[PDB]
């Protein structure tokens, strides 16, 4: 769809290509992410 | 002049002329962006250099392969102000040409093949305003171009390796650009050897051997062969005359018949000049000469094939008579003199065991790949691919040039690969600074040392997006159906531009800029550091590179450091410098010739400078003649001193090309030391604008040019006449001619209001200037937050004394009036916002509605329908500015608040408050809000309402825009037709466009008449996608993350005023901090009543010494003298020709002034205005050498009339009377800062604590606890104070219990202790335990 | 543990326990199966790999990092340095009913 | 003017080549050390009672009413060396290399630097600074040591 389109669709426009509804692309799209280690420095600085 | 200066002149002091206007200043950036950019063709750079680089790229059979042909980038779909808007990153987009090529491999080549020629969407780019910023969702953003080691050749040698020997070793180092690394060393027992990219060692000889080759040609090579003969019994041998030199004669060196030398004689260079006089090489000699001698080459009897003796083999008597008897009445032999040629090579060669080239290539190979089984292409491919391959390695002819360099040779460029010749002429002269000949190189000398600006890294970037590219390019390539798998089938953008991000926004050179000041900007542009990859680290980093090099002179500022850990690490650059194409530098110079100074220039670098003599511009002119002094202070060599005057190359141009600019504005610091003066330029970026622009009366000159260079400001783009004004955005007309004819020649700038700096601080614009006026090209239209005229304001000039008074300046402490405060001048503004979302659950949506329970209806009050603030509202910490509410479950309790609310008996809640409140400890004022909504979640009502608000805001502005412009051009529509007939009110009355009927004169005028149609259509089609696109742009809504449905935002006001703490400082180091604001009649006074605005402590200055603060006091009380006088002279209304005469005068004083004016030049409003402008005080210019001088100071005070000691008997506040003795008085410029204690200070009773430790928090922020290190501790152990140690141990920080028992304790009044035991100890038990030990404890 | 974005935060522990209890899982159940001993040895290479990198990540082998490439915490380091307990949280300490 | 002229002369015996540079280094360098001492005291005199005041007689003069004097008096600010940095010349100058150089300073803050002057002011000045920053953490290194065994 991007080489189709040159640039990034759309929750609607892939709810009709994928052929599913909305309610699952913006479903799976609040899902599909992991975790980020606690010990990572933020802090830029080694402080925090 | 011109009309802005006019307005406001500053005085200078200055007498050597300058020959240079300066440059523009972040042309760096800009340029290295366009390098990246700018469609190279040849000299290939950045993107071009990339596809050049990498392409055309085939499969594995021979048919089809990939071709570059072209590319181009879009216009953004965004404009710059929607992305900030938005928060989105700017960026353009990216078209490429590609043609899937492929070959008939039936044929040979049969190219009438498939070809998709076709082009190609991937990924947008970052791009660069035309100031020099990335704005980053939103945020402008900076990165900065570093430095580093420069690739190539390095050589040097420690003092001190091993501790028996104490003595020196002597080692190289190379790289190349691209691929692996490589380095030879000596050791101590005379023996070359190798690494590559610290591997371990190895003899060099087995990777000679590795290359093809032989020890034949070795001995060919590195030495002479020095022949024998035994003709019949007895040893002969030539001899060139200069190898026995400085050497001892072992026998009595004779000749045919004739001694020159005895045995145990040195061969003196006289005994070599007979020798050579009387032509004689060949010498009778003993054979007992050779025995120790090493044959020079592999020798057998020619039956045998057998070696009678092996080369690289010492040599005998024994073997002297076997060859001989084999044939063999010559022999070549080894050269061997530690004073002339010497011996490393066959000791290396005799330590080489391995004995075949294929020995060689595999301990190569082995070493390469220990443990691994060696075969053959295995070691061969290996050992090509490291050094011979084009792919994995690349010199950067840079490196290719350097390398010519570093052998001398005639050329420059060749591959990125070596050759044989190179190594080996490096080997050669390795052993040659060996044996003393040549050096190693030298470190923190700048031709060592190379940039690396953005473009530069944006490419590396790049090509290894490339390469991620393609491994899955070749694979689909070889792999997959040729004739339909489309170029773009295998396509993936997606590693490329993530990163792209990853650069942008995780480096440690992407970074939030510092908008607090056009200083601060600028210089964080100009700045330059060492660090991250091919970098350094603090910890591992030492003290000779923070430290100063002679060749930093003239190419950087020594001044500006950081006051912290990067001591000398960062630093920026100095003012006039330039690059070496390459990434190294140069500099201007004034060529000096025959005495006579070449006013012409030459870039120099730093290399050629120490070979040429230099002169300064501190020399004075022998009036276009030479230098005046015989002994001229000239410089050379990595050195100046004191030669004669037509022996000069060069000089100078300027006394402050050394300098950075926030070293170059603090005048008179010569005067002055240096400590003070860096860390006066550090808090000088710091500064604050106040809330009006108040100018200096102190300057340097060139303040002018960083206010504009910021393009933080309006400019006259186009000389014109002022238009239409308003109080956001003003028109001009621009001149006919600046006109070009195209185009109507009428700009616009629609200026920026109250905004966010980065840093939280106010921002807007506003006109300096009026209507129906003149002006010149590239004037500026409106000041900024900081500024004036087209000039600095970052501070404000008022009235000092020197002096103590009953401790309140005791330690650099500062005391003021209150009169200040009556005219709020140092009052400034900041900004807070804030924010929230519209969720959906996994109950529901989160619901955004005014709509809440109990409610203390005194903060719904201030709330709409849809639960928002109205505009104009004032508000503190608390308050409810947003109703939002979640999706709630249920619960229970106990039977005390059961039998509670069954008494009450309130009911039916199944919903939660999720709504936003101010910060407890805050107040400030409404201004500005803005909702996202998603494309497709619908418009909630005042959504609509303010988008359609904005549809209206901004039809109108449009509107407004092509109403003046088509004004402008049916100007054009009257004005042509009027000369041909007329039909002076035929035409009016009736309707417009029903002119095409009246008078018409056939021939041509119809033509006339349906041009008119045709630019009435295109105005309206123009103004109709005009609409339609903007009106779109306005109404699409937002690509939102998923469950986010909508979200608001707000943005305060809030101003600050002035209190005790809020630090203080001028340009001078000049520190101070506040106890306190005094009544005005408690002010010490004059004569005549004025009292004072500062008081300070004189203790200190001659310890610290800025005494250019003095100089500048002197002046600060003269210069707004002569305000007075004429500011009576204006009230009092005297005449044009008295200020006239008094004013002139006054400029033309000093003793030789560079610049020169006229008043009798302008006319006379002229004259009224920058009267008008100079009554507060005439401002000056101070060059921070060439400044002026005390005469200058005292002539002045003179005329001014006051004492030209500039110190004055004064009276008392408190009580009336005279002091003891006078004190200095006068103006000074002064700055206030960030560090303020509103923003600092801090308290914390009880609150959140940690999670795994039960501990409280630190930060402000989240209402933090203060930490106490454990010194602290140490205190009290020297004091003994167990129970608060307990105390503080236990109940504040870890114990639960503790701390509950302790405030229910002290509600009841109960001052009594409990402890438990920290949860930190049993944790770590656990911790232990699960490391899997009994630890335990012994109970009592 | 959560934030807002139901997007959550982890240790750099629990995978190791995670590899570790699924190495016993794969040896186990290879060892239903009577197969060769030398994918047993590998298998329990690995198994003594990941135990001594849990006692001691970046002691032995090339350090065992995540996504982050940053070398992952063992227990040890938590005991350990400055950010180790004594010196960290057990002697310096934040502090209620304080301020500045 | 003295010290140009001495200077001058043993140029012309270092151009002859009898004396060599190192012991010519050390007569320099001294008689630069010299001349700061003669113009240490010149300044000192000249300042500490450069002040005459009559009392009932003739003429008599006793210890200073400047400011800058009884700053250093007091032991309040200020010292011998430092109203010498401000006043005379200071001394001469160790660039980075801990070398010391042979061409000390001739004006002062009162007069104004020259370019080079400041220009090598910085070496030593910025040698001191990063001494400031870094040698604390011995300090506090060596101080939890020294505790922690006792």
């Known amino acids: 769809m991007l080489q189709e389109m040159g640039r990034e669709p759309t929750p609607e426009e892939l709810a009709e290509r994928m052929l599913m509804p909305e309610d699952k692309i913006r479903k799976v799209l609040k899902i599909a992410k992991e975790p980020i280690s606690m010990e990572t420095p933020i802090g830029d600085d080694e402080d925090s | 002049y011109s009309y802005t200066e006019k307005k406001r002149i500053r005085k200078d002091f200055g007498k050597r002329p300058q020959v240079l206007d300066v440059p523009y200043l972040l042309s760096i950036q800009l340029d290295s962006f366009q390098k990246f950019i700018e469609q190279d063709p040849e000299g290939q750079y950045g993107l071009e250099a990339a596809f050049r680089s990498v392409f055309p790229i085939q499969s594995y059979s021979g048919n089809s392969e990939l071709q570059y042909v072209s590319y181009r980038l879009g216009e953004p779909v965004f404009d710059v102000q929607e992305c900030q808007i938005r928060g989105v990153t700017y960026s353009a987009p990216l078209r490429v040409k590609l043609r899937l090529v492929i070959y008939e491999r039936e044929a040979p080549e049969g190219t009438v093949k498939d070809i998709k020629e076709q082009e190609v969407y991937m990924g947008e780019i970052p791009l660069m305003t035309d100031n020099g910023t990335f704005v980053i969702n939103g945020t402008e953003r900076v990165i900065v171009s570093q430095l580093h080691r420069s690739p190539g050749v390095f050589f040097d040698s420690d003092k001190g390796k091993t501790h028996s020997s104490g003595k020196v070793l002597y080692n190289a180092r190379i790289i190349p650009y691209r691929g692996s690394w490589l380095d030879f060393e000596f050791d101590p027992k005379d023996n070359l050897f190798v690494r590559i990219d610290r591997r371990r060692k190895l003899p060099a000889t087995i990777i000679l051997r590795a290359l093809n080759y032989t020890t034949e040609q070795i001995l060919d090579l590195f030495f002479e062969k020095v022949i024998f003969e035994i003709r019949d019994n007895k040893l002969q041998m030539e001899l060139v005359p200069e190898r026995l030199r400085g050497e001892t004669a072992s026998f009595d060196i004779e000749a045919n018949g004739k001694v020159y030398v005895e045995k145990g004689r040195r061969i003196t260079a006289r005994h070599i000049r007979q020798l050579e006089k009387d032509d004689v090489k060949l010498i009778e000699v003993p054979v007992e000469y050779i025995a120790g001698k090493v044959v020079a080459k592999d020798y057998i009897d020619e039956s045998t094939g057998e070696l009678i003796c092996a080369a690289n083999m010492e040599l005998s008597l024994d073997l002297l008579a076997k060859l001989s008897q084999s044939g063999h009445k010559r022999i070549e032999t080894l050269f061997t003199n530690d004073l002339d040629h010497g011996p490393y090579i066959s000791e290396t060669l005799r330590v080489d065991p391995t004995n075949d080239r294929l020995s060689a290539l595999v301990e190569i190979y082995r070493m390469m790949r220990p443990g691994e089984p060696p075969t053959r292409e295995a070691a061969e491919s290996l050992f090509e691919n490291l050094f011979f391959s084009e792919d994995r390695y690349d010199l950067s002819a840079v490196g290719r040039m350097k390398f010519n360099r570093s052998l001398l040779r005639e050329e420059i460029e060749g591959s990125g690969i070596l050759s044989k010749d190179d190594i080996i002429d490096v080997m050669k002269k390795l052993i040659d600074i060996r044996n003393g000949k040549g050096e190693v190189d030298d470190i923190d000398h700048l031709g060592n040392r190379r940039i690396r600006s953005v473009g530069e890294m944006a490419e590396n970037q790049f090509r290894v997006g490339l390469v991620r590219v393609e491994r899955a390019v070749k694979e689909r390539l070889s792999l997959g159906d040729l004739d339909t798998l489309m170029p773009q089938d295998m396509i993936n953008a997606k590693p490329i531009s993530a990163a792209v991000k990853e650069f942008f926004g995780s480096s440690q050179l992407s970074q939030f800029m510092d908008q607090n000041n056009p200083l601060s900007e600028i210089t964080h542009k100009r700045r330059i550091s060492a660090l991250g990859p091919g970098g350094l680290t603090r910890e591992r980093a030492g003290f000779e590179v923070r430290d100063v090099h002679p060749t930093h002179y003239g190419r950087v500022c020594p001044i500006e450091t950081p006051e912290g850990p990067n001591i000398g690490l960062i630093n920026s650059l100095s003012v006039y410098a330039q690059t070496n194409e390459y990434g190294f530098l140069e500099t201007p110079y004034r060529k000096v010739t025959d005495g006579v100074v070449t006013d012409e220039i030459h870039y120099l670098s730093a290399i050629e400078e120490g070979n040429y003599v230099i002169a300064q511009a501190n020399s004075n002119l022998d009036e276009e003649g030479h230098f005046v002094e015989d002994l001229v202070t000239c410089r050379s060599k990595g050195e100046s001193s004191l030669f004669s005057r037509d022996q000069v190359d060069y000089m100078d141009v300027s006394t402050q090309q050394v300098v950075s600019v926030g070293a170059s504005l603090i005048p008179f610091l010569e005067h002055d030391d240096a400590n003070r003066a860096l860390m006066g330029a550090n808090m000088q970026r710091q500064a604050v604008p106040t809330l009006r622009a108040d100018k200096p009366l102190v300057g340097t000159g060139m303040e002018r040019a960083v206010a504009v260079d910021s393009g933080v400001t309006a400019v006259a783009k186009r000389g014109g006449v002022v238009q239409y004004v308003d109080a956001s955005r003003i028109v001009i007309k621009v001149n006919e001619d600046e006109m070009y004819p195209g185009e109507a020649g009428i700009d616009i700038y629609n200026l920026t209001k109250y905004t966010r700096s980065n840093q939280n601080t106010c921002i807007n614009q506003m006109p300096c200037v009026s209507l129906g006026e003149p002006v010149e090209r590239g004037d500026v239209l409106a000041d900024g937050p900081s500024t004036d005229l087209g000039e600095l304001a970052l501070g404000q000039n008022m009235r000092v004394a020197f002096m103590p008074w009953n401790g309140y300046n005791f330690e650099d402490s500062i005391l003021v009036s209150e009169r200040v405060v009556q005219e709020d001048r140092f009052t400034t503004i900041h900004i807070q916002e804030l924010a929230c979302v519209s969720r959906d659950t996994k109950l529901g949506p989160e619901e955004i509605t005014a709509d809440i329970p109990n409610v203390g209806e005194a903060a719904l009050s201030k709330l709409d329908e849809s639960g928002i603030v109205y505009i104009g509202a004032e508000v503190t910490g608390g308050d409810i500015l947003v109703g939002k509410v979640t999706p709630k479950g249920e619960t229970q309790l106990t039977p005390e608040e059961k039998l509670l609310r069954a008494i009450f008996g309130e009911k039916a809640s199944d919903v939660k408050d999720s709504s936003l409140r101010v910060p407890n400890g805050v107040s400030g004022t409404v201004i500005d809000v803005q909702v996202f909504t998603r494309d497709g979640v619908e418009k909630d009502k005042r959504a609509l309402e303010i988008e359609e608000m904005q549809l209206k805001q901004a039809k109108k502005d449009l509107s407004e825009e092509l109403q003046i412009l088509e004004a402008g051009l049916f100007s054009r529509i009257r004005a042509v037709l009027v000369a041909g007939g007329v039909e002076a009110e035929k035409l009016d009355k009736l309707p417009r466009d029903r002119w095409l009927e009246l008078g018409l004169t056939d021939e041509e005028k119809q033509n006339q008449l349906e041009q008119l149609a045709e630019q009435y259509d295109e105005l309206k089609h123009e103004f109709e996608k005009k609409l339609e696109a903007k009106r779109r742009k306005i109404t699409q809504g937002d690509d939102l993350a998923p469950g986010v449905l909508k979200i608001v935002k707000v943005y305060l006001a809030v101003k600050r005023r002035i209190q005790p703490g809020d630090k203080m400082a001028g340009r001078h180091g000049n520190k101070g901090v506040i106890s306190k604001i005094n009544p005005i009649e408690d002010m010490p006074y004059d004569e005549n009543g004025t009292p004072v605005d500062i008081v300070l402590n004189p203790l200190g200055v001659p310890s610290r010494m800025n005494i250019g603060q003095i100089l500048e006091t002197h002046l600060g009380m003269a210069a707004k003298g002569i305000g007075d006088k004429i500011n009576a002279m204006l009230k009092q209304q005297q005449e044009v020709a008295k200020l006239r005469e008094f004013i002139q005068r006054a400029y033309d004083l000093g003793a030789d002034v560079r610049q020169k004016v006229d008043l009798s030049t302008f006319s006379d409003e002229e004259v009224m205005r920058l009267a008008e402008n100079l009554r507060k005080g005439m401002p000056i210019a101070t060059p921070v050498f060439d400044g002026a001088k005390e005469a200058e100071i005292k002539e002045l005070l003179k005329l001014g009339d006051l004492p030209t000691s500039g110190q004055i008997r004064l009276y008392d506040g408190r009580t009336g009377e005279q002091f003891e003795r006078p004190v200095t008085v006068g103006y000074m410029y002064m700055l206030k800062l960030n560090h303020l204690v509103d923003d600092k200070m801090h308290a914390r009773s009880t609150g959140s604590y940690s999670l795994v430790t039960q501990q409280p928090l630190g930060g402000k922020a989240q209402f933090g606890g203060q930490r106490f290190g454990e010194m602290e501790v140490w205190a009290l152990e020297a004091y003994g104070a167990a129970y608060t140690l307990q105390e503080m141990l236990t109940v504040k920080s870890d114990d639960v219990n503790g701390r509950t028992k302790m405030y229910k304790n002290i509600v009841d009044g109960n001052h009594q202790m409990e402890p438990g035991m920290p949860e930190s100890f049993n944790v770590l038990l656990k911790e232990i335990r699960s490391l899997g030990i009994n630890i335990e404890l012994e109970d009592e | 543990v959560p934030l807002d974005g139901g997007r959550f935060a982890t240790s750099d522990l629990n995978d190791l326990y995670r590899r570790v209890i699924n190495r016993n899982n794969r040896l186990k159940r290879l060892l239903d199966l009577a197969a060769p001993d030398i994918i047993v040895r590998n298998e329990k290479r690995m198994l003594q790999e990941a135990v001594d990198a849990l006692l001691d990540n970046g002691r032995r082998g090339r350090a065992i990092t995540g996504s982050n490439k940053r070398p992952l915490k063992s227990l040890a380091d938590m005991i350990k340095g400055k950010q180790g307990r004594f010196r960290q949280n057990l002697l310096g300490k934040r502090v209620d009913y304080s301020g500045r | ?150």
């Not at chain 4, 200073?64 to 200020?78: K, L, T």
């Not at chain 4, 940095?85 to 001469?92: C, D, E, I, S, Y």
């Not at chain 4, 100058?93 to 002057?117: C, H, W, Y």
Request: glycine share 8%; proline share 1%; no cysteine.
């Open chain 4, 1 to 150: 003017s003295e010290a140009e002229a001495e200077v001058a002369e043993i140029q012309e015996q270092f151009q002859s080549g009898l004396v060599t540079a190192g012991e010519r280094y050390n007569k320099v360098i001294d008689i630069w050390a010299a001349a700061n001492d003669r113009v240490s005291k010149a300044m000192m005199d000249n300042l500490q009672t450069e002040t005459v005041i009559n009392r009932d007689g003739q003429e008599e003069k006793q210890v200073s009413f400047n400011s800058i004097y009884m700053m250093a008096d007091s032991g309040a600010r200020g010292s011998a060396a430092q109203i010498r940095q401000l006043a005379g010349m200071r001394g001469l100058m160790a660039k980075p290399d801990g070398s010391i150089i042979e061409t000390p300073i001739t004006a002062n803050f009162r007069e104004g630097l020259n370019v080079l002057q400041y220009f090598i002011s910085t070496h030593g000045a910025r040698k001191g600074l990063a001494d400031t920053a870094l040698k604390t953490a011995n300090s506090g290194y060596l101080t939890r040591r020294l505790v922690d065994v006792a």
